[PDB]
C-alpha cells in the first residue's frame with residue numbers, strides 16, 4: 106500500500122555525470138562511451154548572453170578550450186561538434202560505467218526521473234512530469250545545467266531530458282539528448298515565458314484508478330458520460346480533452362478495477378463540479394495529474410483491494 | 412528555483428542490495444563488508460505468524476538454511492546471529508561496493524530516502540518523514556521487506572531504516588540497523604495500529620522560510636506571538652508544541668530571511684486560524700510538514716530572492 110511520486114534508482118546515471126568547463130563557465134555533462142554531452146551555452150560569454158551566435162562562438166574554440174573532469178580525473182577532449190543545442194565532446198577514455206542506454210524524445214504528459222547535479226556531482230533525485238506547456242516543475246539552482254532526466258526499463262536507461270535554463274516563473278526548460286528543445290524556448294537571454302498550462306486529464310484518470318486499486322471508492326457515482334459531454338466540462342476546468350486513444354490506454358486499469366472508463370469520467374466530472382468536500386484521495390486534497398497510466402501500473406499492486 | 416521532495420542519489424545503496432531466502436520466504440537484505448542484514452521474520456513459518464518465538468525458530472536453522480543472492484551470484488552463509496529484530500548473516504565474500512557508512516537511529520520528524528526493492532532488485536526511490544507516531548507513509552508491496560532508508564553526507568551513507576511490515580491503515584513500520592523498532596510495533600501478526608499522529612511544527616516553519624527564500628511573502632503579517640500563546644493555538648490544530656530548542660534550530664533560516672522566528676510563528680498562527688484563502692505556498696494548497704530545516708538549507712539557494 107501507499108502511493109508516492111517515485112523516481113527510478115539513479116546509480117546507473119550517477120556513473121555518467123562529469124563536469125565541463127569552458128572559460129569561466131562550469132556545468133554538468135553526460136559521459137557515455139567516449140562522448141560527453143553538455144549544453145552548448147557552456148561557450149556563451151558572460152558579456153553577451155543576449156545575442157550569442159553559437160557557430161561563431163564555437164569556431165573560436167579548440168579541443169583544449171574544454172576541460173572535462175570525471176571525479177578527480179581529467180578527460181582529454183580529442184574532438185568536438187555541435188548538434189542542435191548540445192555539444193558532443195569526444196574524449197580519450199570510454200566510460201567504463203556506461204549502462205545500456207537509448208535516447209528518446211518524450212511527449213507532454215509523460216514522466217521521468219531527474220538527477221540534479223552540480224559541478225559534476227549528483228545532489229538529488231526526483232520525479233517530474235513534462236507539462237503540456239513543455240516545462241518541468243523542477244528544483245534547480247545555478248550550475249544545475251546539464252543535469253539529465255531519464256527512465257529505466259530492464260536495466261536500459263532511456264535518457265530524455267537535459268536541463269538548460271530557468272524561466273521567469275521558476276519552472277525549467279531543456280532539450281532531448283539530440284539537443285532539440287522541448288517547447289518553443291531558445292538558449293539565450295530573452296523575454297520568453299512559459300505558455301498557459303493545462304491539466305493532464307489522462308493522468309488524473311489513471312490516479313483515480315490507482316485510488317480504487319488501493320481500496321478507495323468514495324468518489325464514484327451511479328452516472329456515465331459521453332466523451333463529448335465530458336469534454337464540455339473539461340474545457341470549463343482547463344483540462345485537456347479526452348480522446349478515444351486515451352480511453353483505450355486506460356483499458357488495463359479499467360479491467361483491473363471493473364470500472365468503465367466513461368464511468369470514471371463521470372466520477373471526475375462530479376469531482377470537478379462539486380469539489381472533494383474536504384476529503385482526500387490517496388492522501389491528497391486535490392486532483393493529481395503527475396502520474397501516467399504506466400506509473401500507476403508500475404507502482405500499484407496487480408490485485409485490487411476489493 | 413523550485414522546491415520538491417528530493418531523495419539522495421541511490422547508487423551507493425543499490426550496490427548493497429541482495430536477496431535472502433529461507434524456506435519459501437524471500438525478502439531483501441543489505442550487504443556491507445562480509446555481513447548481510449535482513450528482517451528476522453524471514454524465518455517465520457507461513458503457518459504461524461501469530462505467535463513466532465524467534466529464538467526457538469532460529470536455533471532450528473543452520474547456515475545453509477539461508478540462501479543469499481547478489482545479482483546472479485550466490486553468497487555462501489558462514490555464520491548467523493540475531494540482533495533484536497534483525498538477522499546478521501556472515502557471508503564468504505566482502506561486498507566490493509561497500510560505501511563508507513554508518514548506522515544511525517533517526518528521531519521523529521527527521522527525513523530520509525527510501526530505496527524500495529523487490530527480490531534484491533532496486534525498484535524506486537523517494538523521500539519519507541518519520542512521523543511523530545513512528546510510521547512512514549511509504550509505497551511498498553509484498554516482498555518489500557528489507558528495503559532500507561538512508562541519508563548521505565559527503566559520500567558517507569548513514570543507514571537509518573529497514574522496512575519490516577505494513578499496518579492496517581496502509582502506513583509502514585520498521586527498525587533501525589541495530590534491529591530496534593521505531594515505535595511500539597512488533598514483528599508478528601497482531602491487532603497493532605498506528606497511534607494518533609500530529610503535525611511536525613518545526614518542519615512547517617522551515618518550509619515557510621523556504622517559501623520566503625524562494626521569493627514569496629504573501630502569508631506574513633505585522634504581528635508577533637509568545638511561545639506560550641502560539642502553543643495554545645498549536646494544541647487546537649493538532650500541531651506539536653514549539654520549544655525554545657526548535658526556535659534555536661531555526662536561527663540560520665531566520666537570519667537569511669530577516670524574519671524573527673516568533674514573527675513566523677505569528678504568520679503560521681494566522682494561516683491555521685484563517686486558512687490560505689485559495690492561495691498556494693511553494694505550489695501547495697496545504698501546509699507541508701515533510702521538510703526539515705536541514706532539508707530546506709540543502710535544497711534552497713543561500714541567497715534570498717528579496
Ligand SMILES: CC(C)(C)c1ccc(N(C(=O)c2c[nH]cn2)[C@@H](C(=O)NC2CCCCC2)c2cccnc2)cc1
Nearest residue numbers: 132146149154245246247248250269270271292293294
Ligand atoms: C547563457 C544563458 C542561455 C542565457 C543561460 C544563463 C544562465 C543559466 N543558468 C545557470 O545556472 C548556468 C549557466 N551556465 C552555468 N550555469 C541559470 C538560468 O537559467 N538563468 C536565467 C536568467 C534569465 C535569463 C536566462 C537564464 C539557471 C538557474 C537555475 C536553474 N537552472 C538554470 C542558463 C542559461
Ligand SMILES: CC(C)(C)c1ccc(N(C(=O)c2c[nH]cn2)[C@@H](C(=O)NC2CCCCC2)c2cccnc2)cc1
Nearest residue numbers: 438452455460551552553554556575576577598599600
Ligand atoms: C511475519 C509477519 C511479521 C507477520 C509479516 C508478514 C508479512 C509481511 N509482508 C510481506 O510482504 C513479506 C513478509 N515476508 C516477505 N514479504 C507484508 C505485510 O506486512 N503484511 C501484514 C499483514 C497484516 C499483519 C502483519 C503483516 C507487507 C506488505 C506490504 C508492504 N510491506 C510488507 C511482513 C511481516
